[PDB]
Design a protein around this ligand. Structure first.
Ligand SMILES: [Mg+2]
Ligand SMILES: [Mg+2]
Ligand SMILES: [Mg+2]
Ligand SMILES: [Mg+2]
Ligand SMILES: [Mg+2]
Ligand SMILES: [Mg+2]
Ligand SMILES: [Mg+2]
Ligand SMILES: [Mg+2]
Ligand SMILES: [Mg+2]
Ligand SMILES: [Mg+2]
Ligand SMILES: [Mg+2]
Ligand SMILES: [Mg+2]
Ligand SMILES: [Mg+2]
Ligand SMILES: [Mg+2]
Ligand SMILES: [Mg+2]
Ligand SMILES: [Mg+2]
Ligand SMILES: [Mg+2]
Ligand SMILES: [Mg+2]
Ligand SMILES: [Mg+2]
Ligand SMILES: [Mg+2]
Ligand SMILES: [Mg+2]
Ligand SMILES: [Mg+2]
Ligand SMILES: [Mg+2]
Ligand SMILES: [Mg+2]
Ligand SMILES: [Mg+2]
Ligand SMILES: [Mg+2]
Ligand SMILES: [Mg+2]
Ligand SMILES: [Mg+2]
Ligand SMILES: [Mg+2]
Ligand SMILES: [Mg+2]
Ligand SMILES: [Mg+2]
Ligand SMILES: [Mg+2]
Ligand SMILES: [Mg+2]
Ligand SMILES: [Mg+2]
Ligand SMILES: [Mg+2]
Ligand SMILES: [Mg+2]
Ligand SMILES: [Mg+2]
Ligand SMILES: [Mg+2]
Ligand SMILES: [Mg+2]
Ligand SMILES: [Mg+2]
Ligand SMILES: [Mg+2]
Ligand SMILES: [Mg+2]
Ligand SMILES: [Mg+2]
Ligand SMILES: [Mg+2]
Ligand SMILES: [Mg+2]
Ligand SMILES: [Mg+2]
Ligand SMILES: [Mg+2]
Ligand SMILES: [Mg+2]
Ligand SMILES: [Mg+2]
Ligand SMILES: [Mg+2]
Ligand SMILES: [Mg+2]
Ligand SMILES: [Mg+2]
Ligand SMILES: [Mg+2]
Ligand SMILES: [Mg+2]
Ligand SMILES: [Mg+2]
Ligand SMILES: [Mg+2]
Ligand SMILES: [Mg+2]
Ligand SMILES: [Mg+2]
Ligand SMILES: [Mg+2]
Ligand SMILES: [Mg+2]
Ligand SMILES: [Mg+2]
Ligand SMILES: [Mg+2]
Ligand SMILES: [Mg+2]
Ligand SMILES: [Mg+2]
Ligand SMILES: [Mg+2]
Ligand SMILES: [Mg+2]
Ligand SMILES: [Mg+2]
Ligand SMILES: [Mg+2]
Ligand SMILES: [Mg+2]
Ligand SMILES: [Mg+2]
Ligand SMILES: [Mg+2]
Ligand SMILES: [Mg+2]
Ligand SMILES: [Mg+2]
Ligand SMILES: [Mg+2]
Ligand SMILES: [Mg+2]
Ligand SMILES: [Mg+2]
Ligand SMILES: [Mg+2]
Ligand SMILES: [Mg+2]
Ligand SMILES: [Mg+2]
Ligand SMILES: [Mg+2]
Ligand SMILES: [Mg+2]
Ligand SMILES: [Mg+2]
Ligand SMILES: [Mg+2]
Ligand SMILES: [Mg+2]
Ligand SMILES: [Mg+2]
Ligand SMILES: [Mg+2]
Ligand SMILES: [Mg+2]
Ligand SMILES: [Mg+2]
Ligand SMILES: [Mg+2]
Ligand SMILES: [Mg+2]
Ligand SMILES: [Mg+2]
Ligand SMILES: [Mg+2]
Ligand SMILES: [Mg+2]
Ligand SMILES: [Mg+2]
Ligand SMILES: [Mg+2]
Ligand SMILES: [Mg+2]
Ligand SMILES: [Mg+2]
Ligand SMILES: [Mg+2]
Ligand SMILES: [Mg+2]
Ligand SMILES: [Mg+2]
Ligand SMILES: [Mg+2]
Ligand SMILES: [Mg+2]
Ligand SMILES: [Mg+2]
Ligand SMILES: [Mg+2]
Ligand SMILES: [Mg+2]
Ligand SMILES: [Mg+2]
Ligand SMILES: [Mg+2]
Ligand SMILES: [Mg+2]
Ligand SMILES: [Mg+2]
Ligand SMILES: [Mg+2]
Ligand SMILES: [Mg+2]
Ligand SMILES: [Mg+2]
Ligand SMILES: [Mg+2]
Ligand SMILES: [Mg+2]
Ligand SMILES: [Mg+2]
Ligand SMILES: [Mg+2]
Ligand SMILES: [Mg+2]
Ligand SMILES: [Mg+2]
Ligand SMILES: [Mg+2]
Ligand SMILES: [Mg+2]
Ligand SMILES: [Mg+2]
Ligand SMILES: [Mg+2]
Ligand SMILES: [Mg+2]
Lengths: 62, 150, 117, 202
RNA sequence: GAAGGGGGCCUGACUGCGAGGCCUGCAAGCCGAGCAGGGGCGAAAGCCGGGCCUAGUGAACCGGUGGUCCCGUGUGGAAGG
RNA sequence: GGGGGAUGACCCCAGGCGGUAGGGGAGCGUUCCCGAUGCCGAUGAAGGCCGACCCGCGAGGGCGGCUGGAGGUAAGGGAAG
RNA sequence: CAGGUGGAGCCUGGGAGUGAGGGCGCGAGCGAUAACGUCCGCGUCCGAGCGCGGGAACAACCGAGACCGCCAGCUAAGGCC
RNA sequence: AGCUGUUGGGAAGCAGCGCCAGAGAGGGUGAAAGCCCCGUAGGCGAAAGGUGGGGGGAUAGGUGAGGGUACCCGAGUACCCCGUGGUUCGUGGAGCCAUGGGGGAAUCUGGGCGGACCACCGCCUAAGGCUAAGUACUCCGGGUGACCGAUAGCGCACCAGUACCGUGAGGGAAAGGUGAAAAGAACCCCGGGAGGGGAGUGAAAUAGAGCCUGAAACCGUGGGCUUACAAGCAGUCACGGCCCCGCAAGGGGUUGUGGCGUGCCUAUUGAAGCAUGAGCCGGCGACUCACGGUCGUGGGCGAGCUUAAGCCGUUGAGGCGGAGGCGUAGGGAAACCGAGUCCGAACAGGGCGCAAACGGCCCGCACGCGGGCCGAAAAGUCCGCGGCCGUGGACCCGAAACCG
RNA sequence: GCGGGGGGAACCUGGGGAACUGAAACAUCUCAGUACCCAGAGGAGAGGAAAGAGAAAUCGACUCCCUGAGUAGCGGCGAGC
């Protein structure tokens, strides 16, 4: 039957129209951190596959 | 013609990898699954677009954001669909959002916003909204109302 | 539609058992041992083909070396004589020449004995 | 193709028609595929190890009997067991694009026209359906049954007249299909039919 | 020829970014000139986005707390994000 | 691959051509459908048993003889227990 | 920067399989300057070349990369009572 | 609507000259038949029982306006709280519907609801009941099949849920075919019978009832070549002998000696391996299908492409149907803006985005200009085919076990 | 006096109601209100004539198909639903 589009792929990523996938960056609990960590802090264009996985996981339509 | 002469093109009904079957059919014995363990098993593997072997997956280590919705669900607010100028050139007429869907642009439960790309035309253009750019571009050649009702 | 084996397998088997005619015991009568035996006959045939070529030359050589030892020399020298003497026309195949045409061989010996010294 | 013979009592006066100049024998074959597919009954079935009569009992302990190792006798490895992957009821129909059927309809007529095999006729007079009556008009119109004929007309009476001929297949016009055109050596229509045929394409 | 020791003024252990690269299976880790804001020390050139450097650490999820513009299920609020 | 300019199946010339996992490519064959209100068939279907013969690189296809006694089913395409 | 047209190279995509390796040489560690031992490095062969020749016999040592055919020639290793 | 002749055991074959067809579907008949039989197209038919959703008729039932009164408008009910279930809602901001427990109202100015709650604005009138049709199914009858054809198809084509096995629940098979017609072999012979030999029947009797075809393993009789000083994965290459076929040359058979030679599969670094599996032969036996997806490919149409259910229509006739879906714009958590947008104080920078392709002809100084006509291509999208993936038993077979 | 009782392939409603399995372990979650057991109904059964929907001054009983849509949401925010 219809494929089910995994929820949280959908809640963590976005497929940037034409054609690939973009996520946030990674750190959520930190005192002593350079003030880069307001760097990134921004969205991150995931590698590959990692994007072909994802993508194929959320489809019909993205 | 004749039913004997019909036939398809050289692409077109390729047909078909099935083995299985012989040695030096290619594809014999292990039937291309290659010996092995799990993948060659009948249930096969665990869904590669996700499973990583038991480490935490590459998705699912990314954080998430922001608003995912809560329980009574999606909120009812008027949606707009932008259509361009370059797009609506061919129309000499009244150009109402009604008419526009009939063309194959403007979808259905969407309000109209004309915008941007293209050059305007001395046309009456009825719609819900105009961009900064499109209002102007229009105001040079022709002229247009704004739609609010119901 | 369903395509059951029917006639196919009996044919394929018959083909091979036919090839196996004359083979010992089951190797002629059982499609499996027939087929197994045949793999073996197949590679021997191929291999023995290349080696029939060896098997024959090595016969020719013993025969030359035999005949011209009557005339008091090595096959070893004989060929060298014939190499120098320009007489590279070979042989070793002919060698009936040593058997059927003794004198023509003898002449060939002497053309050989006298070359490059 | 363009210039197509009409038969009136008046005369042999000839008609011109739009009718595309290139036929696409692949396209053609595609509609025929489809025609023959959707008409498929798809009634072939078989029983899986699950659907077979016998019990689920394990036939033997599975260690120490010295025999091989087994489940139920409904297992496909058993003579008399389930079938693996054989046929179940299914629907061979698909949906051809409609424009492909128009094109294909048009082209197949075109192909008969391009051969001079297509004929339009007015009014018959081999009506009052009797195959003896038809078989007369047929002769007079140059159809001896040396070539198979597809007869398209809305006249119930002429249709039932030709029906029983071994060399005639017969159709209402609203039922014009390409498979039927291609099977038959010559196409024959009346002008009522040619109209609705023209009103179908385009 | 300071990165060592002493003293004086100081809080750049800034905010908004970041060319281009090191590394690297991914995700991470790393260095970074330069522009803008407002500063510090300096006569200036200049330096300053912690510490001679390489360890002092923990993805996501769930939740806390403070703030803000954002959404608020007929509407205004509010609940909750 | 290069020429020959027949547009190949065709002729020259030069190369390459061990192989498991595996990728790619072309073929053969079995059942069924259209082709079939057809065509082959008791002057003998399918099937069986021989063959040192013909065609194919091969899977196979022919042909001949014997058996058999009522079926078989081209070219070209479709579908699979 | 030059030679190098190669079953070379780069880019995008489709399909894999593999993730038990082994011997030998050389370089180390572990071991006892033991192991057909174990663990890395660089190379090779077996793997997949248990096809051919040499080594009595013998995956991996020497020779050598088997498209088919020949009752033709020259060689390699190793040999010539 | 059909006869004759002909081969033949048999005509329906072949031949001659005919004929019917609203019937050339199909099955029979000694082989292959529109016209011999049974049918088919087209028609027809119920005294009796069933039905009767259609037509008709009856009966039941139904049918007002303004004012005034404030009488009635479903109780252990609503409502609130506790405990739970239902919903996509797993305690969540958790309403709605239901209700085991406790408390427990009102009758239009009454009550419930629009997702905690409050206001406002709406929706609806709970605590009584019934209601065709459109829908599910298939013991049953019928019709069709790119359904099976006796290891298949139901477990059962046959006196099968039987034999048989189990205390029982329960399990559960094998097993079809002489011939056109029994004409099913009188009689004689051997023999206790069985069986066979003659005879006879038959087109045929290695169609003789243990009967169509009659494969293979297996057993046997006869013939040819061969073998008792050789030793081996049984073959192979060479020569020679003997036998056969052929004028010949050539070939088939067999094997004496010589050379060479470590079964098949599987699993492994590595197997002839003293590692797995296989007594042998026949037959059964394992990469499918649906719906999604993703690529490729063959075509259709291209700023568009395409229909789903369903409606009409049909010797296996197709048509209609535009709800919908993908596409045509993106950025942003969102408000929102938009060829941009997001972070930002920034018109710094950066992230993610946006940019018609050809030929050729009309033309603004000339051969491209640029717009534009003509149209080869194409975004895209549709269908087919193929690879792969996702979900499903998802290549087949196999547990120990778990639950009812 | 009238009725009930029991049977029926599947289909239907109602009372009750699992586990293996999935989560590559496992408790919530899944499998699944499935299997199954029980009562009852019929040729169907259920449902049904708004104390509805839910944003439009909107729609009008119920059932069934297509679609909305794998959307809104739900979710050890996992698997998945
Ligand atoms: Mg945070
Ligand atoms: Mg969508
Ligand atoms: Mg093969
Ligand atoms: Mg292959
Ligand atoms: Mg292979
Ligand atoms: Mg594979
Ligand atoms: Mg295996
Ligand atoms: Mg594998
Ligand atoms: Mg392994
Ligand atoms: Mg598995
Ligand atoms: Mg772990
Ligand atoms: Mg976060
Ligand atoms: Mg959302
Ligand atoms: Mg088979
Ligand atoms: Mg040699
Ligand atoms: Mg020489
Ligand atoms: Mg069928
Ligand atoms: Mg079962
Ligand atoms: Mg059991
Ligand atoms: Mg045993
Ligand atoms: Mg069965
Ligand atoms: Mg200081
Ligand atoms: Mg960078
Ligand atoms: Mg500054
Ligand atoms: Mg978790
Ligand atoms: Mg949070
Ligand atoms: Mg801001
Ligand atoms: Mg607000
Ligand atoms: Mg509300
Ligand atoms: Mg509100
Ligand atoms: Mg060559
Ligand atoms: Mg090769
Ligand atoms: Mg006869
Ligand atoms: Mg057949
Ligand atoms: Mg025959
Ligand atoms: Mg056929
Ligand atoms: Mg099979
Ligand atoms: Mg260079
Ligand atoms: Mg390479
Ligand atoms: Mg690749
Ligand atoms: Mg390893
Ligand atoms: Mg290695
Ligand atoms: Mg190693
Ligand atoms: Mg050395
Ligand atoms: Mg070792
Ligand atoms: Mg060692
Ligand atoms: Mg090595
Ligand atoms: Mg291996
Ligand atoms: Mg070797
Ligand atoms: Mg190699
Ligand atoms: Mg060996
Ligand atoms: Mg050796
Ligand atoms: Mg080679
Ligand atoms: Mg030497
Ligand atoms: Mg006669
Ligand atoms: Mg006759
Ligand atoms: Mg004939
Ligand atoms: Mg018949
Ligand atoms: Mg005939
Ligand atoms: Mg007949
Ligand atoms: Mg009748
Ligand atoms: Mg009152
Ligand atoms: Mg309430
Ligand atoms: Mg709940
Ligand atoms: Mg709840
Ligand atoms: Mg929870
Ligand atoms: Mg409320
Ligand atoms: Mg209430
Ligand atoms: Mg409401
Ligand atoms: Mg309401
Ligand atoms: Mg009430
Ligand atoms: Mg009521
Ligand atoms: Mg009812
Ligand atoms: Mg029935
Ligand atoms: Mg069949
Ligand atoms: Mg049987
Ligand atoms: Mg059976
Ligand atoms: Mg049989
Ligand atoms: Mg059975
Ligand atoms: Mg008993
Ligand atoms: Mg007789
Ligand atoms: Mg007899
Ligand atoms: Mg016989
Ligand atoms: Mg017989
Ligand atoms: Mg018979
Ligand atoms: Mg018999
Ligand atoms: Mg004998
Ligand atoms: Mg001796
Ligand atoms: Mg002897
Ligand atoms: Mg012995
Ligand atoms: Mg020998
Ligand atoms: Mg095998
Ligand atoms: Mg093993
Ligand atoms: Mg092992
Ligand atoms: Mg081992
Ligand atoms: Mg042994
Ligand atoms: Mg053992
Ligand atoms: Mg063994
Ligand atoms: Mg083992
Ligand atoms: Mg094995
Ligand atoms: Mg077998
Ligand atoms: Mg698919
Ligand atoms: Mg596909
Ligand atoms: Mg496609
Ligand atoms: Mg119909
Ligand atoms: Mg900017
Ligand atoms: Mg930008
Ligand atoms: Mg940019
Ligand atoms: Mg095009
Ligand atoms: Mg296309
Ligand atoms: Mg009852
Ligand atoms: Mg009852
Ligand atoms: Mg229930
Ligand atoms: Mg459980
Ligand atoms: Mg468990
Ligand atoms: Mg589990
Ligand atoms: Mg598991
Ligand atoms: Mg466990
Ligand atoms: Mg549930
Ligand atoms: Mg009842
Ligand atoms: Mg009812
Ligand atoms: Mg009711
Ligand atoms: Mg559920």
């Amino acid at each position: 039957p219809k494929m089910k589009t995994h929820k949280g792929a959908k809640k963590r990523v976005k497929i940037t129209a034409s054609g690939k996938v973009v996520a946030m960056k990674t750190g959520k609990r930190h005192l002593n951190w350079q003030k880069s960590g307001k760097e990134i802090r921004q969205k991150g264009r995931k590698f590959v596959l990692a994007k072909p996985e994802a993508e194929r996981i959320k489809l019909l339509l993205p | 013609m004749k039913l004997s002469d019909l036939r398809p093109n050289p692409g077109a009904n390729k047909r078909r990898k099935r083995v299985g079957r012989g040695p030096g059919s290619g594809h014999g014995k292990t039937a291309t699954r290659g010996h092995k363990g799990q993948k060659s098993r009948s249930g096969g593997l665990k869904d590669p677009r996700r499973f990583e072997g038991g480490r935490s997956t590459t998705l699912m280590r990314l954080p998430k954001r922001g608003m995912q919705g809560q329980v009574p669900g999606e909120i009812k607010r008027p949606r707009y669909q932008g259509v361009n100028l370059k797009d609506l050139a061919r129309f000499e007429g009244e150009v109402t959002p009604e008419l526009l869907v009939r063309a194959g642009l403007l979808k259905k439960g969407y309000r109209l916003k004309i915008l941007g790309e293209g050059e305007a035309k001395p046309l009456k253009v009825v719609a819900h909204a105009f961009s900064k750019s499109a209002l102007e571009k229009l105001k040079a050649a022709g002229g247009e109302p704004v739609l609010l009702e119901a | 539609p369903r395509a059951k084996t029917g006639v196919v397998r009996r044919r394929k088997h018959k083909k091979i058992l036919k090839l196996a005619k004359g083979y010992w015991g089951l190797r002629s009568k059982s499609f499996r041992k027939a087929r197994e035996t045949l793999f073996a006959a197949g590679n021997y045939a191929y291999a023995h083909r290349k080696r029939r070529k060896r098997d024959f030359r090595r016969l020719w050589i013993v025969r030359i070396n035999a005949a011209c030892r009557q005339h008091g020399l090595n096959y070893s020298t004989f060929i060298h004589g014939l190499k120098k003497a320009g007489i590279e026309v070979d042989r070793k195949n002919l060698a009936d020449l040593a058997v059927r045409e003794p004198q023509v061989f003898a002449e060939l010996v002497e053309r050989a004995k006298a070359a490059q010294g | 193709v363009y210039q197509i013979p009409v038969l009136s009592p008046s005369g042999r006066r000839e008609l011109a028609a739009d009718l595309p100049a290139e036929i696409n024998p692949h396209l053609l074959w595609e509609v025929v595929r489809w025609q023959l597919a959707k008409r498929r009954r798809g009634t072939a079935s078989t029983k899986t190890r699950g659907e077979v009569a016998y019990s689920g009992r394990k036939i033997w302990p599975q260690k120490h009997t010295g025999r091989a190792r087994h489940g139920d006798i409904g297992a496909p490895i058993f003579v008399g067991g389930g079938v693996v992957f054989g046929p179940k009821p299914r629907d061979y129909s698909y949906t051809l694009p409609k424009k492909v059927r128009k094109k294909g309809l048009a082209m197949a007529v075109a192909d008969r026209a391009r051969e001079g095999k297509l004929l339009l006729v007015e009014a018959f007079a081999g009506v009052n359906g009797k195959t003896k009556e038809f078989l007369a008009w047929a002769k007079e119109a140059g159809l001896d049954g040396s070539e198979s004929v597809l007869l398209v007309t809305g006249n119930e009476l002429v249709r039932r007249a030709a029906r029983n001929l071994p060399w005639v297949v017969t159709l209402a016009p609203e039922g014009l299909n390409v498979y039927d055109i291609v099977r038959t050596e010559r196409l024959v229509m009346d002008l009522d039919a040619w109209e609705v045929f023209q009103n179908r394409i385009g």
